[PDB]
Amino acid sequence: ALGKLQDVVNQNAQALNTLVKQLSSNFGAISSVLNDILSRLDPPEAEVQ
Amino acid sequence: VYAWNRKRISNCVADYSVLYNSASFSTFKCYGVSPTKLNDLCFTNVYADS
Amino acid sequence: PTYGVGYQPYRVVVLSFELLHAPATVCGPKKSTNLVKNKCVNFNFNGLT
């Protein structure tokens, strides 16, 4: 019966979870970790990624 | 070149900057990591294909 | 020895780092410091910044 309100809960939560899981994407970079990129590359090369 | 020697390097401390300032290396192209940062990193294995 | 500059032998060494950091065994000099707990610190645990 409360599927209406719950679906709202499960849609907000799902959107947030996708947003969080999009932090683990390279998007073409060498890594998805800014700290790894920064610790591995000098700034002129790092900025590109 | 057709029979290039591969040496696996592990369980040691590598002074990459030392090697860097050792001779006249006409090419030091480091892809994916900058040479000056090589001292701040730990690698699982180093393969030296010569 | 009388060959052209572009035809002379170059000794090429390719260093291939297997970058996983989990069983990290090759490291730089990077003198370690003492561990600091229960305090906001900038850590460098085995290459993991």
In three-state secondary structure terms, C28 is coil
Q: Give the experimental resolution in Å.
A: 3.5
Least Cα distance to A42 among C14, B6, C10, B34 occurs for B34
Residues 6+ apart with CB under 8 A from B17: B35, B36, B38, B39
Q: What are the beta bridge partners of residue B43?
A: C26
Phi-psi sector, B11: left (phi>0), alpha (psi -120 to 50), beta: left
- Integer angstrom CA distances of residue B48 from B2, B37, C15: 15, 18, 5
Would an 8 Å CB–CB cutoff place B17 in contact with chain A? Answer: no
Would an 8 Å CB–CB cutoff place A15 in contact with chain C? Answer: no
Residues 6+ apart with CB under 8 A from C26: B9, B10, B11, B12, B13, B14, B42, B43, B44, B45, B46, C17
Would an 8 Å CB–CB cutoff place C33 in contact with chain A? Answer: no
Which residue matches tokens 């040691």? B12
**Residue type at position C36:** V
Which of C16, C22, C25 faces B49 most closely, judged by CB atoms? Answer: C16
Which of B34, B40, B41 faces A45 most closely, judged by CB atoms? Answer: B34
Cα–Cα distance, C14 to C1 (Å, whole number) = 25
Residues of chain B neighbouring C47 (CB-CB closer than 8 A): 40-43
